[model samples]
Target chain A: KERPLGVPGSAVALALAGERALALEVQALAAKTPFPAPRRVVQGLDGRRVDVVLAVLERRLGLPLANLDVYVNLAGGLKVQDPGLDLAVALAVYSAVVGRPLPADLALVGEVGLAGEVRRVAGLERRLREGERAGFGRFLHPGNLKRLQEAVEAYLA
Target chain B: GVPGSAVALALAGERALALEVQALAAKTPFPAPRRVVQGLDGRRVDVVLAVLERRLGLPLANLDVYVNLAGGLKVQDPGLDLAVALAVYSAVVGRPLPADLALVGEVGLAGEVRRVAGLERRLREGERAGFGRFLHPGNLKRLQEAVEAYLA
Candidate 1:
């Protein structure tokens, strides 16, 4: 990037366990790190759920994060338990590693699946307007992952 | 929702975009100052490491190396060598670079920075973005002359 930091950033997304698409800033330190192995220190979401997301990232995306330490934290003392938080957490990590920020206007809903599928989550429409109201102009549900990934790839390209 | 929608998207998207910004290295609090490389171009890094140890006088033997290539695409570009070299220097210096600077060039087997594509175009963009300086190649009769350019 044009600028340097002690570490890089990964921000954006929602807390789906509460069945909402409200914005929360998740910080991902994509540092050229020291200490030890690459693991995600996740806040708000259960540690076990992150395994599915990490597995999907390694298996599907081929991220070599088996050594770098990745720490994810919700903006506040935020806490929630839901499968719906999967996509947000997954994207947070992806965005961190690549050093590209996800669009602030984007919100997502889904559960990460074993074969790396995006499974639908709760309150799809209810979470929609509030997402727009929160200045998120774009939204991606699990049903829309195919189109969504294409759009993201187009932007990346 | 599609059954395979979630993990499928990032996997497909990353395949097409291969530029990685952070080439991370660090001095471990533990033993073995390892070298981890996730290459946007893996071969280039391998060559760079070999050349750095031999030509640049790095004690690479003391370190364990891990090169991570996140982008699923295989690469064979010449220009990416410069970025990997800088990342190595970054770890070696163990000091924070100004953070804004960007470099582009290729590494010859001798560990010297050499010519690469679109030098003027890349410099133009860097200048437009208000870059401070470049550790690039060219502006010479032969790449050997530019060796001092990058090293100097």
Candidate 2:
């Protein structure tokens, strides 16, 4: 049975793994763990160039950024290559750094603007479907609430 | 390897002679084993040579071996038994089989080549990729007839 175990690359799998790593890193950093303690940082494109928004959070929120292992995964292999997911990833990491758990039932889906505004994303319905199937009840998205309401109604029926 | 195994069984059932070809390339070894093994590890080498010799009736020792299963994933499909045999044969006897000849088959433990499923899909993929000849075992009568009718 010495076969290579197939690891699932799905979003839920990644999120669960990330949560565990985040919790461990936060604890170790709080306890003054030594250097290179599984630290992960994520950068995103902010309009023209890539920006380290997560670094800003670390600085402003007084969170320890050094000597910690941090992993930032764009859930579901969906390639969050835009600057929008910057805030979401930052918030998630922050929650982990502070040893605070994000509400399990809440999911955030939107882009972050350079001015820190939450911008709308494309394929609202599809993204909502993904969220629903993954057991998310409340979604935090940007843009027109009217359209999202309509989409939710359509999904329900 | 999973997909390759599936392909081999489908080919064997069709009765057309199928041959599997693979490549071996060097890469960074895992942490364990301490020493880097030469020539695609012993087990894989043995299995491949055995399939070629026992099933295809090829003289394993005389064959010039070259198998490249890209992405560092080793393929061990029993269906590839016939294809590997053919590739080795082609290299050994100095007769290069046409690049257009598509082959598939699965060699059983008892040296009997077994049938496979999804022959039609495999043949279609090969044909679409501009291969001319389609080969498989007798069990794939439906696929053979379909391909023949379409080609006509």
Candidate 3:
């Protein structure tokens, strides 16, 4: 299954493994449920972490999630535990809920806190090195933006 | 009546963290998907629910869950995690843990019971309050074992 970039729910990011930065793709889907769904149904990532991000999105950005059924997956079947993936995942879900796609050349990396702050990742320079080599010129990280709300607003159409 | 209630201890603000935790988990026929959390952080409670479903195989998808740190005491300590899990479990299973048993531990995503701060100090406080039995990371290795010991 080849998922095209620029799809509304798909996001491309970078993950640092040891000293090398690897490309990672994340996908998310949010469907309106007639009934109020109480749980987050997700695969290929930590549901607990996703729930925390969702809470931040709701509390900080005023995103409506209680009536939506959210599903997320780490594209390509590769599992990663790096907190840096938080921003990409959040953006993917945000893109899905809003029916918008981030710039295809834009890459994201950050650790999200409960306060909606986008904490810096570990390897920024190396990640940007790979990002440039991988043809990605624009990046969304904590250095440029302080909060997740600002990140959402950066790409808001 | 107290449907699902438990006690836990922790360290907060350089003092021993002690509080009563309560939860009510029920499946509703209608779409009443209320997730009410007070005193304790609601996000942490969501984490506990995710752990319950992942590790324990509890079907909580449509459950209207409510959690409370009784007496309106709002404190954020990972040590209350075990008590939250137990209280939620008791609510689902419709059973109550022994009143004399007090708990303290930080529950990891994998259901591992991690150590908390001021173990001896928390224990002494519980002991002072006539709580004889204690369950914590120091004594218990996993959250599954704690639930199985008391609820199951």
Give the alpha carbon lDDT tens digit for every residue of A1-157 in model 3: 2235455767777787545687777766665654545446665567788888888878887778878766676644345777888898889888878888888888888889999999988888877778788888889877787888888878954
User: For each candidate, what's the DockQ?
Assistant: 0.02, 0.02, 0.02
Q: How much is B10 displaced in model 1, in angstroms?
A: 41
- The C-alpha stretches of model 2 lying farther than 4 A from their native spots are A1-33, A36-51, A75-84, A133-135, A144-157, B1-152
Best model per TM-score = 3
Give the CA lDDT, 0 to 100, for residue A72 in model 2: 42
Clashing pairs in 3: B10-B17
Report, in order, each candidate's fnat. 0.00, 0.00, 0.00
Show the lowest summed lDDT stretch of 10 residues, model 3 chain A.
A1-10
TM-scores of all predicted structures: 0.46, 0.33, 0.54
RMSD of 1: 17.3
lDDT: worst 10-residue window of model 2 chain A = A21-30
**Model 2 residue A68 lDDT score:** 49
Better of 2 and 3 by lDDT: 3
Candidate 1 lDDT over residue span B1-152, tens digit each: 10100000011122222233344444455554655554344434655665555446565655655544345544444555655654554455344334345565555433445455456666666666565665555532223343344433
Q: Report lDDT (CA) for all predictions.
A: 0.53, 0.38, 0.77
* Docking model 3 quality class: incorrect
> After TM-score superposition, what is the CA distance of residue B150 in candidate 1 from its true location, in Å?
38
Candidate 2's residue-wise lDDT over B103-147, tens digit each?
A: 655432223333545656666666666667655654322222322
